[PDB]
Ligand binder design. Structure first.
Ligand SMILES: *[C@@H]1O[C@H](CO)[C@@H](O[C@@H]2O[C@H](CO)[C@@H](O[C@@H]3O[C@H](CO[C@H]4O[C@H](CO)[C@@H](O)[C@H](O[C@H]5O[C@H](CO)[C@@H](O)[C@H](O)[C@@H]5O)[C@@H]4O)[C@@H](O)[C@H](O[C@H]4O[C@H](CO)[C@@H](O)[C@H](O)[C@@H]4O[C@H]4O[C@H](CO)[C@@H](O)[C@H](O)[C@@H]4O)[C@@H]3O)[C@H](O)[C@H]2NC(C)=O)[C@H](O)[C@H]1NC(C)=O
Ligand SMILES: *[C@@H]1O[C@H](CO)[C@@H](O[C@@H]2O[C@H](CO)[C@@H](O[C@@H]3O[C@H](CO[C@H]4O[C@H](CO)[C@@H](O)[C@H](O)[C@@H]4O)[C@@H](O)[C@H](O[C@H]4O[C@H](CO)[C@@H](O)[C@H](O)[C@@H]4O)[C@@H]3O)[C@H](O)[C@H]2NC(C)=O)[C@H](O)[C@H]1NC(C)=O
Ligand SMILES: *[C@@H]1O[C@H](CO)[C@@H](O[C@@H]2O[C@H](CO)[C@@H](O[C@@H]3O[C@H](CO)[C@@H](O)[C@H](O)[C@@H]3O)[C@H](O)[C@H]2NC(C)=O)[C@H](O)[C@H]1NC(C)=O
Ligand SMILES: *[C@@H]1O[C@H](CO)[C@@H](O[C@@H]2O[C@H](CO)[C@@H](O)[C@H](O)[C@H]2NC(C)=O)[C@H](O)[C@H]1NC(C)=O
Ligand SMILES: *[C@@H]1O[C@H](CO)[C@@H](O[C@@H]2O[C@H](CO)[C@@H](O)[C@H](O)[C@H]2NC(C)=O)[C@H](O)[C@H]1NC(C)=O
Ligand SMILES: *[C@@H]1O[C@H](CO)[C@@H](O[C@@H]2O[C@H](CO)[C@@H](O)[C@H](O)[C@H]2NC(C)=O)[C@H](O)[C@H]1NC(C)=O
Ligand SMILES: *[C@@H]1O[C@H](CO)[C@@H](O[C@@H]2O[C@H](CO)[C@@H](O)[C@H](O)[C@H]2NC(C)=O)[C@H](O)[C@H]1NC(C)=O
Ligand SMILES: *[C@@H]1O[C@H](CO)[C@@H](O[C@@H]2O[C@H](CO)[C@@H](O)[C@H](O)[C@H]2NC(C)=O)[C@H](O)[C@H]1NC(C)=O
Ligand SMILES: *[C@@H]1O[C@H](CO)[C@@H](O[C@@H]2O[C@H](CO)[C@@H](O)[C@H](O)[C@H]2NC(C)=O)[C@H](O)[C@H]1NC(C)=O
Ligand SMILES: *[C@@H]1O[C@H](CO)[C@@H](O[C@@H]2O[C@H](CO)[C@@H](O)[C@H](O)[C@H]2NC(C)=O)[C@H](O)[C@H]1NC(C)=O
Ligand SMILES: *[C@@H]1O[C@H](CO)[C@@H](O)[C@H](O)[C@H]1NC(C)=O
Ligand SMILES: *[C@@H]1O[C@H](CO)[C@@H](O)[C@H](O)[C@H]1NC(C)=O
Ligand SMILES: [Ca+2]
Ligand SMILES: [Ca+2]
Ligand SMILES: [Ca+2]
Ligand SMILES: [Ca+2]
Ligand SMILES: [Ca+2]
Ligand SMILES: [Ca+2]
Ligand SMILES: [Ca+2]
Ligand code: NA
Lengths: 929, 692
């Protein structure tokens, strides 16, 4: 929120050169000066016979915004032979990526083409150039003798690059191995020490590199983007890369071990073609020394309010924990087609608040699509999803979108003011712009009035001019300020005071200052940085008894403080800024003496009670809980009376009830002040003597927090009086209860079988399902609908196995769906049958029973366990059932008994029920009628 | 009696209307000071108010153009109309609503445009051969569904640039198949070949002249071609009143937006046409592939139906892409494009089997709710689309337009249109915020008694300090004045304790939060309900203790969404066929069913007990589905009478039942045999046998 947008440094390059496509800071150790580095991928150079070779410009910051090309390579194409170039530097896009660590600068040409020395070719291996002062080596890992597309021919190495802390280069090549992609890391020392201009294919000793894999991974673009950070024990930077076409264009992000290129963690996008992995970034956003992963998907489509898909782009934020598991949330863009998430640039601590910050770009957002950059501050709880500042592009298109935001870089305090600054690139208009961070001031104001209770009959001090005396009081206001970094010694504040603020705009001015005789009074003020809480006093009197009529409405003293930051600016005009979460004003209020007894002091007798609701709070879901409170003042008047309902974490305040016309509609509000959550309700100012209130406070308590007895609310009335200012605190326990609507249901497929069975031939020694009869499926489902969960249950299935030595329903195989195991007391499928590719009731009471018993684990709300029993109709039995024609109802039954719950310290009760499932075997042919 | 009008509208005529649609104003001085000025229309009459001096605007929605629905699409006489009405003037007063209706017809014998956009990678050499006679062969089958048919042709490979293209050796440019011991055309992004013509033979001619090329990497650049075929309306030659089919044929995966960066292409697709006289996509080398969002936007505008005709190896892929571009249909193409014909026909019927309404340029403070009458007279609430339709069928939609507050704009026009249709209902919305009597207002003093206030609509309203009925008291200190009845009663506190009663009225205290209004200072601008720390769930404005929900939210808390998309199943069925979509969430009704869209129901009866009804409906003219007249709609599977049942094939479910005639009927059904669904019935049900 503290980035200056009034006077930002604006740099420019040759039109069409894509000046600004890549940006970074240059912070050499050999100099106390700092510079800007800008890539111009399409820039024309003095390289002989090379068109648009591209260049990298070093830009001064001290005064003149002058940009000078760095001389990496002045030579044109080397030759394989006469009239036969070995390389092609034209349109190589040199400058398309720029990185700098201290005195060393790395720049790359991802479209540099290479002939190879085997055959006439033009393969985009890509190359990089590493410079250090005057020495310049050429790093080009993909330019090896492993040629063609199956090799590293189309690697385009240098497409994305980064240094690690231990001076080590990470390099991405999206085209290696049929566009699978590749990561290659080398020691900077070896990149320099092993350089040899007479060898086009240098091999470095301590090289780390991902290797080719199966062809299903083709066209994934590994190394499209790269970032580095630590994601394991050792303090070694690991490798983070975006793989935007991975997983059928779902996109992925790979993380490799910085020690030996071993795979660590993967991320996967959720919407195809969203280009998840277009941009990556690593930075510790919640001040816990654990680097956090940011992933950009600029073409993500979220669901609009209408319900329709809309392309707004999305950024994934993954918080790293010491456990190894990431804690990930998601962050969506604000404009359609703006491509929010095209660039994610860490800023370090932009406002020096103790937590790092980050910038996300939407380079085609804003009106006239000039480009937007959003700033997000970090905090202990993670990243604050609400942007504290937007940065708008200032240049309109010519032939291409300005693309302001397409490249960015921060985390480098370039003016040494104590605050890191930010470079934004706009390659569409060949522009790069540097925003400086402004110093942040934390100011706390004081305001007190002596005395608080005004007595109209106490005319003490004299009124200037007249011989009259007045009932006066003191108004003392204080200002202390301090801020980190570089900022002035003294500060100019424009403080103004107002008497009876809540009673103006055509109302009567009820309290005035002694001299101005007006409710308003301004004052220039200059305080010193630190702990010098400079204060100033004023004397304000009170109009005569006859002047006004209202004497119950408190007299609100209002103070607001401005800042002459147009004066406190530095030499370059970098004006400070106030902390955004600080109130620019403050209010106190005095009250007039009224009905306070003979002692002139109001001593209330506050007391609060809560009706026994007897409501139960069933563990598992959200519970409607309405507390009824009675707040009465059986003493004198209580100024600024407030009901304080301190609530537990599991509870949220819905609102005060209003449907009841016999219940007071209090003005309540929920504040999270300090580490305590509570509800505050105004009870009157003052809550007059004898006043009694009945109010309803609706709540909803979300639970399922396992073992607990109950939840309690604490209630206490408090006032701003000096004597008996509070009431006795009252606790209200509401018992937690267990309830689990557990049901069991069944079904037969089919639920009937008609005889005779078509094409059924009786075989003495059956082998297949076809030989026995039709398939009959019984499915049993035990489901826990209820709020509460249960931990253990038993399921008992009784199966009609035989009727007088006759097999009926022959069980082949049973399956299980959910937290349960089953066990049949009889051997299932004894005859090893495999293939694939007046109605009389036969229950287990009158038939030989096959029992299947099942132990069931924990079923939470909405979960279930399912038993699939696949059986065959033993046709033989029904054909020669002594006689043929008869109607049978094959009945199976399943019961369940819930035996345990996880909520051990709470009243429970075992749950039991059962259902039955029939398969009716009848004769569709009736030989009567 | 005491109402909302007499407690909020008393301030002024404009705010009187703003209070409620049922409020009315009085512009007659004859009414003595003491009676309300803003009240019900009847109550003002009852208080003897001059009917001419009464301001009572009424919201209306009159139809401006009401052409009837066409019966044939080949109607050369009158212009084909498939939507009625066509234009409605809507006029609303503050916070008022007005419902209306629209009829959409899938007109019989509608004209058809078919642009054949073809992958010409080397793998498609055999396909290019099988479609040599596709034209005439296609013209016959289409004749069964339409008389007026135009077709065209277009081809694509990929961007003629590294790394997608061979650029070395020099012989590779002229012939990408130099090493493959043959010849193929050089690389080309997209070339338009045949403009949409009714001369079907021209297709066959042009196709035989074509030849394939060869790309280096697997993904191609079809998306470029899809975009260009969509927005180059003149080149391709899309007809206004014709169904537009864009047949996309490929056998490989595809490049997507941002892929172009490797090629050095970083200019985002502009969605504009770039196919010129040479009939080649000129921007191919300089502009990136189009994003799915962009393709959707342009397909929707130009009313184009994208048909993904892809081969088995890439079906699941393009299937998933299709779900990101709604309205797009995917078909499975053979390796030689032999079955491209039936694919197109099957796709067409699928396309015209549904009607979904879309809204364009809907004003900010205006909300629309929909009801859908798709089948018979069954009214489906909260739905704006119908499925399972046959050509010739007509659906209906009931719509309600409600405004929040009253936006003081000039004139706004928006569109309610069925997706892919040319015809539409254009709604001209006008807002009646202020009264007409305010036009003849009086600036200050003069007529407003001896004071220096202001006077309009037969009433006065002074300035700072002056709170008198007609400019009486000054900046207070004007004695007790009236004291007044500044409360619903008298034993009750004054001005709801949020102000003092000065000069026969209330003067509400200020508040840092927001605004305190109302006759008795009883209106609260920030006491509305909360759902999760936010007021009105952060989806509604607080108006005197009431939440006024945003364009897509409902409920007293403003936390219930009007969305249905999160209730749609894989069947394209709302909560399957088992529940209803309440607040973007399926509430399951079908016994023992569950899941986010009621997809799961393991204890539901076997599929036999459902298909049976179709057999009783289609093949016996009886059963529940017959009685409710839902046979044709619900039973769409082919039901073929057969002699005997087979054991060969796969997925043969044997279903039997006893009908009203006490005969045992047996039937089996196929599922995804090829995306289809057959159902065979033994033609000789097992009946009783007489003597015997
Ligand atoms: C983040 O996501 C990424 C992307 O999804 C994951 O990366 C993938 O991880 C998997 C799992 O390790 C990798 O699969 C492995 O691939 C190995 C590659 O070997 C290749 O070259 C050799 C020749 O040197 C070839 O033999 C292989 O190809 C052959 O087989 C394939 C089919 O698999 C055929 O298509 C080919 O024609 C060849 O015939 C490869 O090209 C591979 O060696 C490895 O195989 C082992 O593991 C599998 C089971 O996964 C076994 O079936 C197999 O037999 C091997 O394991 C046995 O044998 C070894 C000895 O060889 C014993 O030591 C073992 O005990 C065991 O008996 C496996 O298939 C994949 O390559 C990789 N992809 C990429 C791009 O990185 C990350 O894992 C993931 N990270 C996290 C944290 O989730
Ligand atoms: C770096 O330096 C180079 C020059 O060395 C500049 O490149 C020149 O850019 C201009 C345009 O900006 C080019 O002029 C145009 O040439 C086109 C034909 O040549 C192109 O295509 C052929 C195809 O074989 C190639 O051989 C050749 O290299 C080129 O790629 C013409 O089509 C143009 O004429 C018409 O079009 C334009 C635009 O529509 C109209 O305004 C004209 O009136 C006319 O109708 C035009 O003449 C020039 O050819 C380029 N030279 C080279 C060698 O490529 C870069 O601009 C410069 N870059 C920077 C950032 O400084
Ligand atoms: C929008 O917000 C409101 C307010 O929180 C939600 O209302 C709550 O809805 C739940 C639904 O489960 C209600 O719980 C029900 O309680 C009844 C007893 O009254 C019980 O029989 C049901 O089984 C269920 O548990 C709850 O009453 C209600 N809360 C209150 C007091 O308003 C609403 O659900 C939200 N809408 C959505 C879908 O976001
Ligand atoms: C590559 O190096 C990593 C560590 O940098 C190795 O990871 C180790 O894996 C073993 C199990 O085999 C763990 O017990 C150790 O904790 C890991 N080491 C460290 C330092 O954390 C990994 O084994 C190496 N790769 C291969 C293929 O061996
Ligand atoms: C009468 O009013 C006077 C004037 O306000 C009071 O005198 C001041 O009391 C405050 C208490 O904080 C002191 O700090 C000031 O120094 C006093 N002012 C003067 C001029 O002495 C006084 O307390 C009141 N007396 C009673 C008994 O009501
Ligand atoms: C506080 O001091 C400032 C100057 O710092 C005074 O500002 C004056 O105001 C006028 C109108 O803006 C300027 O044109 C003058 O130049 C200022 N005077 C001076 C001395 O520079 C301001 O009057 C002071 N404020 C109060 C309320 O005392
Ligand atoms: C006194 O401080 C309060 C709280 O900081 C101010 O309230 C904010 O005022 C700004 C500007 O008017 C509004 O945009 C915000 O919505 C208010 N914030 C909150 C929390 O409501 C108030 O403006 C200040 N009063 C004066 C006169 O400066
Ligand atoms: C179903 O049976 C399995 C196998 O006995 C149980 O899973 C085992 O749980 C024990 C707990 O003592 C573990 O030690 C084993 O490691 C588990 N087995 C395997 C293969 O890992 C499971 O508890 C049973 N489920 C229920 C609900 O009874
Ligand atoms: C297409 O999308 C579907 C989802 O609609 C994918 O189906 C699932 O994919 C996930 C992730 O790979 C797998 O874990 C599941 O096993 C798949 N389920 C099903 C129903 O098969 C599918 O993989 C996608 N196919 C392609 C080619 O993109
Ligand atoms: C869609 O159907 C529903 C249900 O009949 C309608 O809901 C009613 O709408 C009227 C106002 O037109 C309300 O007064 C009723 O309270 C509503 N009933 C219920 C149960 O919601 C809805 O109006 C219909 N939509 C349209 C545009 O007619
Ligand atoms: C509008 O809808 C209402 C029900 O809300 C219905 O009774 C009425 O007939 C409809 N009016 C018109 C003209 O569509
Ligand atoms: C208002 O009008 C009166 C004449 O009726 C005039 O005397 C007076 O000056 C005006 N008010 C002010 C503030 O000038
Ligand atoms: Ca590490
Ligand atoms: Ca962290
Ligand atoms: Ca910070
Ligand atoms: Ca700085
Ligand atoms: Ca007292
Ligand atoms: Ca192909
Ligand atoms: Ca083929
Ligand atoms: Na607990």
């Amino acid at each position: 929120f503290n980035l200056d947008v009034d006077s930002p440094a604006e740099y420019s390059g040759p039109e069409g050169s894509y000046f600004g496509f890549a940006v970074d800071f240059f912070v050499p150790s050999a100099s106390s000066r700092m510079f800007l580095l800008v890539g111009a991928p399409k820039a024309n150079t003095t390289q002989p016979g090379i068109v648009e070779g591209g260049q990298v410009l070093k830009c001064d910051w001290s005064s003149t915004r002058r940009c000078q090309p760095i001389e990496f390579d002045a030579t044109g194409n080397r030759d394989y032979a006469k009239d036969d170039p070995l390389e092609f530097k034209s349109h190589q896009w040199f400058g398309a990526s720029v990185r700098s660590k201290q005195d060393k600068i790395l720049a790359c040409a991802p479209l540099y083409h290479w002939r190879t020395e085997m055959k006439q070719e033009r393969e985009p291996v890509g190359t990089c150039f590493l410079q250090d002062g005057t020495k310049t080596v050429e790093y080009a890992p993909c330019r090896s003798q492993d040629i063609d597309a199956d090799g590293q021919g189309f690697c385009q190495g240098g497409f994305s690059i980064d240094f690690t802390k231990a001076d080590r280069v990470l390099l991405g090549g999206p085209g290696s191995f049929y566009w699978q992609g590749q990561l290659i890391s080398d020691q900077v020392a070896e990149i320099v020490s092993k350089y040899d201009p007479n060898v086009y294919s240098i091999k470095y000793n301590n090289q780390l590199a991902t290797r080719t894999a199966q062809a299903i991974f083709d066209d994934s673009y590994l190394g499209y983007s790269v970032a580095v950070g630590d994601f394991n024990g050792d303090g070694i930077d690991d490798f983070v890369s975006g793989v935007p076409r991975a997983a059928r264009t779902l996109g992925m992000v790979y993380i490799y071990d910085g020690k030996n290129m071993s795979s660590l963690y993967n991320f996967t996008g959720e919407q195809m073609a969203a280009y998840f992995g277009f941009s990556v970034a690593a930075t510790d956003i919640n001040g816990d020394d654990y680097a956090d992963v940011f992933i950009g998907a600029p073409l993500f489509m979220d669901r609009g309010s209408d319900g329709k898909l809309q392309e707004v782009g999305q950024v994934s934020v993954s918080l790293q924990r010491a456990s190894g598991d990431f804690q990930t949330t998601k962050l969506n863009g604000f404009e359609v087609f703006a491509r929010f998430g095209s660039a994610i640039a860490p800023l370090g601590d932009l406002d020096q608040d103790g937590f790092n910050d980050i910038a996300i770009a939407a380079p085609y957002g804003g009106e006239d699509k000039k480009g937007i950059v959003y700033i997000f501050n970090g905090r202990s709880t993670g990243l604050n999803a609400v942007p504290s500042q937007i940065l708008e592009g200032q240049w309109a298109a010519r032939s291409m979108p300005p693309s302001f935001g397409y490249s960015m870089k921060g985390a480098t305090d370039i003016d040494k003011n104590g605050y890191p600054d930010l470079i934004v690139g706009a390659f569409g208009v060949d522009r790069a712009i540097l925003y400086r961070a402004r110093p942040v001031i934390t100011v706390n104001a004081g305001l007190e009035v002596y005395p608080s209770i005004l007595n109209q009959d106490n005319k003490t001090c004299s009124l200037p001019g007249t011989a009259l005396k007045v009932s006066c009081f003191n108004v003392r206001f204080c200002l202390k300020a301090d801020g980190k970094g570089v900022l002035p010694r003294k500060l100019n504040f424009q403080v103004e005071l107002l008497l009876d603020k809540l009673k103006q705009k055509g109302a009567i001015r009820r309290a005035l200052f002694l001299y101005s005789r007006s409710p308003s009074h301004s004052k220039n003020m200059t305080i010193s940085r630190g702990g010098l809480m400079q204060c100033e006093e004023l004397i304000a009197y009170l109009r005569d008894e006859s002047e006004f009529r209202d004497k119950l409405t408190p007299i609100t003293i209002f103070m607001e403080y401005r800042l002459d930051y147009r004066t406190a600016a530095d030499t370059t005009g970098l004006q400070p800024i106030l902390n955004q979460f600080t109130p620019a004003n403050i209010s106190r209020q005095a009250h007039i003496l009224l009905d306070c007894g003979e002692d002139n002091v109001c001593k209330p007798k506050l007391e609060v009670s809560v009706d026994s609701d007897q409501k139960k709070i069933y563990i598992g879901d959200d519970n409607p809980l309405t507390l009824i409170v009675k707040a009465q003042n059986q003493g004198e008047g209580a100024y600024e009376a407030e009901l304080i309902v301190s609530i537990p974490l599991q509870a949220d305040f819905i609102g005060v009830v209003r449907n009841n016309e016999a219940l007071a509609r209090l003005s309540c509000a929920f504040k999270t002040e300090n580490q305590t959550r509570q509800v505050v309700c105004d009870l009157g100012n003052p809550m007059k003597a004898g006043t009694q209130l009945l109010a309803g406070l609706r709540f909803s308590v979300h639970q399922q927090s396992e073992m607990d007895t109950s939840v309690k609310f604490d209630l206490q009335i408090q006032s701003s009086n000096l004597f008996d200012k509070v009431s006795p605190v009252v606790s209200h326990k509401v018992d937690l209860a267990v309830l689990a609507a557990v049901e069991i249901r069944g079904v037969s497929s089919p639920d009937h079988v008609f005889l005779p069975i078509p094409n059924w031939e009786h075989k003495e020694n059956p082998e297949t399902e076809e030989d026995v009869g039709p398939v009959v499926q019984h499915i049993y489902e035990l489901r826990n609908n209820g709020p509460s969960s249960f931990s253990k249950a038993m399921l008992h299935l009784q199966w009609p196995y035989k009727y007088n030595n006759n097999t009926l329903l022959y069980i082949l195989h049973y399956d299980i769906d959910g937290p349960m195991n089953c066990t049949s007391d009889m051997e299932i499928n004894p005859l090893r049958i495999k293939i694939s590719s007046d109605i009389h009731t036969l229950g287990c009471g009158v038939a030989q029973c096959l029992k299947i018993v099942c132990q069931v684990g924990r079923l939470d709300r909405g979960k279930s366990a399912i038993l699939y029993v696949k059986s065959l109709l033993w046709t033989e039995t029904f054909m020669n059932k002594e006689n043929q024609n008869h109607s049978y109802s094959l009945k199976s039954s399943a019961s369940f008994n819930v035996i345990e719950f996880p909520y051990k310290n709470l009243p429970i009760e075992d749950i039991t029920n059962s259902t039955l499932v029939t398969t009716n075997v009848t004769w569709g042919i009736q030989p009567a009628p | 009696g005491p109402n909302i009008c007499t407690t909020r509208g008393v301030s002024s005529c404009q705010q009187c209307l703003a209070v409620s649609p049922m409020c009315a104003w009085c512009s007659d001085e004859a009414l003595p000071l003491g009676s309300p000025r803003c009240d019900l229309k009847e109550n003002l009459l009852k208080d003897n108010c001059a009917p001419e001096s009464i301001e009572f605007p009424v919201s209306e929605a009159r139809v401006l153009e009401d052409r009837p629905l066409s019966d044939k699409g080949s109607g050369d006489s009158s212009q084909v109309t498939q939507v009625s009405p066509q234009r409605i003037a809507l006029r609303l007063r503050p916070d008022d609503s007005k419902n209306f209706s629209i009829q959409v017809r899938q007109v019989e014998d509608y004209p058809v445009d078919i642009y054949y956009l073809m992958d010409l990678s080397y793998s498609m050499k055999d396909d290019l051969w099988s479609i040599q006679n596709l034209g005439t062969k296609l013209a016959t089958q289409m004749r069964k569904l339409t008389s007026n048919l135009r077709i065209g042709f277009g081809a694509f490979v990929d961007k003629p640039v590294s790394p997608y293209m061979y650029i070395s050796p020099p012989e590779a440019l002229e012939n990408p198949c130099y090493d493959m011991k043959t010849t193929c055309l050089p690389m080309f992004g997209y070339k338009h070949v045949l403009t949409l013509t009714d001369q079907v033979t021209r297709f066959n001619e042009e196709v035989k002249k074509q030849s394939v090329s060869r790309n280096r990497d697997a993904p191609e650049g079809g998306f470029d071609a899809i975009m260009q075929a969509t927005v180059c309306d003149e080149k391709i030659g899309w007809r206004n009143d014709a169904s537009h089919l864009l047949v996309f044929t490929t056998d490989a995966k595809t490049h997507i937006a941002l892929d172009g960066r490797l090629a050095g292409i970083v200019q985002p697709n502009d969605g504009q046409c770039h196919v010129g006289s040479d009939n080649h996509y000129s921007a191919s080398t300089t502009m990136d592939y189009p994003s799915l969002g962009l393709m959707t936007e342009k397909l929707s505008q130009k009313n184009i139906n994208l048909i993904f005709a892809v081969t088995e190896n890439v079906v699941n892929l393009y299937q998933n892409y299709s779900e990101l571009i709604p309205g797009t249909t995917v078909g499975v193409l053979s390796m030689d494009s032999s079955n491209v014909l039936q694919l197109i026909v099957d796709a067409y019927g699928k396309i015209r089997s549904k009607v979904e309404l879309e809204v364009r340029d809907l004003p900010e403070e205006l909300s629309l709710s929909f009801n859908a009458t798709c089948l018979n007279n069954e009214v489906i609430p909260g739905l704006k689309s119908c499925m399972g339709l046959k050509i010739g069928d007509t659906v209906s939609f009931s719509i309600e337009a409600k405004v929040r507050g009253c936006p003081q704009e000039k004139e706004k026009s928006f569109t309610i249109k069925p997706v892919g249709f040319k015809d539409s209902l254009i709604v001209q919305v006008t807002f009646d915020c202020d009264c007409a009597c305010q036009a003849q207002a009086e600036p200050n003093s003069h007529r407003c008694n001896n004071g220096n206030g202001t006077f309009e609509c037969g009433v006065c309203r002074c300035g700072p300090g002056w709170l008198g009925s007609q400019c009486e008291c000054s900046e207070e200190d004007y004695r007790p004045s009236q004291q007044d009845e500044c409360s619903p009663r008298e034993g009750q506190p004054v001005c709801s304790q949020r102000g003092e009663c000065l000069c026969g009225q209330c003067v509400c205290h200020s508040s840092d939060f927001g605004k305190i209004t109302g006759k008795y200072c009883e209106c609260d601008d920030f006491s509305c309900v909360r759902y999760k720390g936010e007021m009105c769930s952060g989806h509604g404005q607080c108006s005197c203790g009431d939440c006024l929900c945003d364009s897509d939210w409902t409920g007293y808390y403003c936390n219930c969404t009007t969305r249905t998309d999160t209730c749609m199943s894989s069947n394209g069925l709302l909560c399957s066929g088992r529940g209803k979509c309440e607040c973007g969430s399926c509430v399951c009704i079908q016994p023992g069913s569950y899941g986010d869209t009621c997809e799961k129901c393991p204890t539901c009866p076997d599929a036999c007990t459902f298909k049976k009804e179709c057999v009783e409906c289609k093949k016996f003219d009886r059963g529940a589905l017959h009685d409710e007249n839902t046979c044709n709609r619900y039973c769409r599977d082919e039901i073929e009478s057969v002699k005997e049942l087979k054991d060969t094939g796969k997925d043969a479910v044997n279903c039997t039942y006893k009908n009203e005639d006490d005969c045992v009927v047996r039937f089996q059904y196929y599922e995804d045999s090829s995306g289809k669904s057959i159902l065979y019935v033994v033609e000789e049900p097992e009946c009783p046998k007489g003597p015997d």
